[PDB]
Design an enzyme around this catalytic site. Sequence first.
Site, PDB file in Angstrom:
ATOM      1  N   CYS A 175       0.849  -1.187   0.000  1.00 47.08           N
ATOM      2  CA  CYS A 175       0.000   0.000   0.000  1.00 47.08           C
ATOM      3  C   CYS A 175       0.886   1.239   0.000  1.00 47.08           C
ATOM      4  O   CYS A 175       1.561   1.532   0.992  1.00 47.08           O
ATOM      5  CB  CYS A 175      -0.957   0.005   1.189  1.00 47.08           C
ATOM      6  SG  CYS A 175      -2.207  -1.279   1.111  1.00 47.08           S
ATOM      7  N   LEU A 176       0.882   1.962  -1.113  1.00 45.29           N
ATOM      8  CA  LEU A 176       1.670   3.163  -1.283  1.00 45.29           C
ATOM      9  C   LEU A 176       0.750   4.326  -1.617  1.00 45.29           C
ATOM     10  O   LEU A 176       0.245   4.388  -2.747  1.00 45.29           O
ATOM     11  CB  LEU A 176       2.709   2.990  -2.398  1.00 45.29           C
ATOM     12  CG  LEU A 176       4.019   3.772  -2.279  1.00 45.29           C
ATOM     13  CD1 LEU A 176       4.672   3.567  -0.923  1.00 45.29           C
ATOM     14  CD2 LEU A 176       4.962   3.400  -3.411  1.00 45.29           C
TER      15      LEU A 176
END
EC number: 2.3.2.23
Lengths: 409, 158, 153, 75, 269, 437
Positions: C87-88
């Site tokens: 998750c960026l």
Amino acid sequence: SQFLDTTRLVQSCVQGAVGMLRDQNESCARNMRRVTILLDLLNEDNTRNASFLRESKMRLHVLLNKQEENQVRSLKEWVTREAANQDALQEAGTFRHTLWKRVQDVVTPILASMIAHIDRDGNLELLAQPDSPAWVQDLWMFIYSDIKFLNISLVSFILVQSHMNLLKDAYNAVPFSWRIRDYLEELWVQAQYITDTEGLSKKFVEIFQKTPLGVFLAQFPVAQQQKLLQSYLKDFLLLTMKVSSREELMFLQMALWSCLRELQEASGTPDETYKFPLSLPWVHLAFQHFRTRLQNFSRILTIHPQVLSSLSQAAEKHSLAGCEMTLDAFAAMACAEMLKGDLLKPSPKAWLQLVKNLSTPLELVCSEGYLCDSGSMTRSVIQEVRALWNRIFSIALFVEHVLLGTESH
Amino acid sequence: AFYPVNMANAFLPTMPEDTQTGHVLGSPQSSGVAEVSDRGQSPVVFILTRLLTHLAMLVGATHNPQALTVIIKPWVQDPQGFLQQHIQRDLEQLTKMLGRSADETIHVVHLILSSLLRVQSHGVLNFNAELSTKGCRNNWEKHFETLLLRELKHLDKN
Amino acid sequence: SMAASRRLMKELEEIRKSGMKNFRNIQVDEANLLTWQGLIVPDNPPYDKGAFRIEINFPAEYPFKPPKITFKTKIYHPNIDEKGQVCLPVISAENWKPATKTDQVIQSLIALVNDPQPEHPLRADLAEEYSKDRKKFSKNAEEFTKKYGEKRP
Amino acid sequence: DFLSELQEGSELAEDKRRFLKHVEEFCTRVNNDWHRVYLVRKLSSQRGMEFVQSFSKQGHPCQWVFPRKVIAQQK
Amino acid sequence: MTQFLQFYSVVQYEEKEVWTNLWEHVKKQMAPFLEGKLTLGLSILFMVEAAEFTVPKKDLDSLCYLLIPSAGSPEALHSDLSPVLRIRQRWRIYLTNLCLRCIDERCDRWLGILPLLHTCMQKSPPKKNSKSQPEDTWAGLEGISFSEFRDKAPTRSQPLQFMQSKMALLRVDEYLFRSWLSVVPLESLSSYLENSIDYLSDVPVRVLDCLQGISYRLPGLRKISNQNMKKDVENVFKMLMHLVDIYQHRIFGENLLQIYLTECLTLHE
Amino acid sequence: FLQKEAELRLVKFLPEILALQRDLVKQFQNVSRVEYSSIRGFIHSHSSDGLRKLLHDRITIFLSTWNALRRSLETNGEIKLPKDYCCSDLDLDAEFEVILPRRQGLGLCGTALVSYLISLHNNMVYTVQKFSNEDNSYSVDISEVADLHVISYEVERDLNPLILSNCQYQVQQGGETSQEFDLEKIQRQISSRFLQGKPRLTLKGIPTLVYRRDWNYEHLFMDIKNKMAQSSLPNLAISTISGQLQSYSDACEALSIIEITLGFLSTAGGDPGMDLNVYIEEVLRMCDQTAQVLKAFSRCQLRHIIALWQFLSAHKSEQRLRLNKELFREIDVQYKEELSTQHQRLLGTFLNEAGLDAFLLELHEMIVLKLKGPRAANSFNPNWSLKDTLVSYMETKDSDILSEVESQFPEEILMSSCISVWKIAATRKWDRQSRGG
């Protein structure tokens, strides 16, 4: 009527109709070709093109009449609907130009769907050819002049689909391959459900001779019937089995001619369905009687492409395709003779790959479930195929059991 | 088997996986395929884990069947007969798959259940005792497959 | 598409000319510019004993859709799941803006790897371990790096 | 197999009945009761020991699959 | 079928001597089924189509009583008779030939043969009018030129008594109410709608079939020129108003409203 | 093979269900027209009784295959389908859209089932041709799959006597009975009878009905850029196409002509010389519409088309701007908002030094190519900036004026005020080219 020049309208709608068509994105892109074809044969000079205009205008009549029963009667009044449409009036300038643009934008997707249904795979070019005889154009303007035999449903970026997965510029030789094929397979399902498998050929040919297509093709003389029959052989074989050559298709067409003539030699002498041996449904009878002996033959030409060259001698040295289906057996002979000619030259490994790919079809051919019954010449050829395949396979077992072992250790 | 209300939407063993917690399985009188073993396991370990799972569900279902209505998804009628049909189907598959008598496979099941007692070597640390995460369930699967191989290799001399 | 491929080609050229000194050995097949692979070389402990191969799959509508990044090397990190998805936020669809360059994305991921963010985890158990007993977490992360991590260049 | 079908379900279509009748006539004709020992071992193999125990009651119409001493000396 | 084909193939021998024995046999076995039965009528229909031989009107009274499917009111019994007569084409043309045979001016009992040939075809087409095709497919006849017969001098009014006696037969299918609507004359059509209140109470969708039947019937008639058709159409529309305002908008259930609106617009047009 | 045997038992049933799907594609090549509720009503909607029972047999095969396999599809199939499809046993009174092989809603059943059987067959043939055969190119399409191409057998006729023919009984002198499974010999019989000599299926000719075809105008553009070497417009041709098209009706007629001719030129070939009229009147044989558009098109060739296209598109819109009309009418209301005073002062600061003739041209093509209307907030969120999406769009293809929009254009134009920026730019263009001259 004289209320609108309909010919000028159709010729105006041709280009916008053809510019919505797409093929399967590489399958012989023919947009300018369809433009040239349709604009060459939507005139009133020849009675051919004049009659094509009268029935094409009747097809627009019946398809728009079925199309406008859905309308809510405030869209049937198109002039009043268009006078209230300010943006199309001020986009088309005057009022009469706006009305002509309205009828053009109505007819154009209908024309596009209709050309997408007729020109399924190349049916138009049989009119675009010169020096094509009367059976071609007569059957083409028999099928296109029938509403119930040839439904045209409607839909917007319409896809026209190919059925024969064809080469560069096929133009299928019977004027409609797919509709006659699907109609004859419907007749096949009804024929094999009504009667048993003894008077199946008789009932199938008679239920073909009842239909209006049958009594249309019956009034042709013998020569045009035989030429249509060979044409229907070549394109039906191109429809069923995808074949990646030209001369392999010639050998497979001679093979299905041998099958049909064999099946017509099976019955002794009825001479009421043998008043039409040069008839359409025999083709289907031959395939539905011989399907594995054709399909296996296609696979033995598909795994091994070179063996066709040996078959390029075979009909020159035996004069086959006269009585019985023998090309599967002669292809077996050519493959076993190529393997018996050499015995060692590329490698043992690629030969193991080739013999394990050819293990199932060549053993399947020399089996009594495959050779159900035939003449004694076919049985003699199959006995020699049995012996030569026993030699080649026993040598192959010897190789794969000791030779690759001693090539490994 | 004794706290089914504490298994409120827990990742049950031998369930399919792409999540879908619970017991998403149809009626046991299904015309489906024979339920081939999943991602990494032997078929004997798979059907043994199915059998121990349906028996512990039935042990928990005899106490408070409303908690097995809130765990098992499709039905609303009864847990006991459903899990009896599952244990019947698992014994059928085990007596096809093992080449024994019926009685001898029942003795094999009681043997493996009995053998799971004297196996005192504790190295099965580091997973949640609630079956709450899929990693903990899969690690439980790996250690229990280890113990099942340790008992299935050593039966023909016993 | 070719439009996507010329932009990715230009970005890769710029990245390979400048260098980053922590993302190395980028290998991309010339026939398909929508998939890149490379080696994350972290600078911070507890991850500095190994390197972590990633794969970046760009959709054909890029830069109007964000790229997706997957990890091919196992890593013990609360923000990275067991399938290597990460998750960026800078490349999340609702935060994405087309001006964002691949080098900024890589620097953001390397920063996230070097300094975990337990408050928004993919592995809540690792996040809990990070929060309530850092010593255990550090221990586990080092041993996990030793057991499964790649060898540094 | 037909007996294991028999306990589980209904009547056997008047021809499997004749086959089981011929098996009954065969086993009551010859005194080669080793094959009857094999029969009870096969029925114990396919279903279980309690299956032939349920056969071993006092008026079940399958009593002829057991030898003469195992039933008179069974409590 | 087979052995009777060879029976006719193997046969001072006049052709009336063949028909005399068949007439004597059907007059013999009509009596035990008169009081105390479809297979007799289907067998004698095969036998006298296989004769090519004129039937009497009074034996049309008998063979039609042998065919009217009394005590067959469940549809499960109709599904039980379908696998004897599974081919949907030979029986359909045979029944259609029987329909065209009784179309001369006796023509009263032939409405009860229609429930046999309305189960060996497609279901009821629900589409809007002037979309499917004209009247022979909607009614379900498909070989009968009834349009000279609804529009004539209706000297044979005994169909309304015959349809008065048998109302429960409307429960056996869905084509038959439509086909009974397409046979009644105009001056006795309001009485036909008045006699069928309880069948519309059983199913409140067949008034859409009434609207479609009137929109089929009107343009076949030309321009209205007398007081008689004005009185007749006024009576039919008043009975139509009656059958609308009795029940509810439960007539309009399960989204049938759009088709009612399109049919009443077509009827107005 | 033993791992996935019970699913490979049913690859035999694949040509029947593909005959089903080919007959449904051949019968129902339409959209939103099939009026059938349940399967039994469709089966009873056929008059030819042999075709009813043939379809009944094929649909019974399909329902049996579906009722068998509907647990591995939602956990091992490559086509992700929801859980409201395969959570029940289908019957002849089920829904009708479960047999029409669509690709979005309720027709993923047939397509996912056929694709999963194909994936099983190709995985097993890959396993064979990876273990020992090490290579093969024998691959048939899915348009001519007969019975002999799929792995077909029976368990009670073809497996059990083969497996019983390789259980070997060994008795030593001391006295034992060892049953041995010689697995090499079992490999040689099972390999050389069922699953060797079979093709490796490719996914080209799958029967598939299509939802809706490509009206994004962009497949046409990349196809014309593939086939042709598309140049830009000359500086004199700009004056040519703008002097001859001051009428609005002539502009709309010319734009209709060139959208038709780019639809032809995209999916076919073109001579890159060959002045555009001798394409119009002679190649696609167009008649005389009006002399004004032909005197306009007299100085253009076919390598100009897309640039030519965007000019008339912008030209039509700017005629709509100078005749005071509602000029878009089709785009979303979300994009149709006003600038504030600060934003329009910074916009005017930009427009004081700007190449308007390419700026508003590129912006109007972008509006009528991307901001189409319904379903346009998919990738085009109305909270991005106009500058970032414009520099990202105009770094794909164009080698135009690029330093100008990067160092001086405002960073926060906030894209959702898109077309009012175009209205201000185009009305400044119109004031320059009309108030001045």
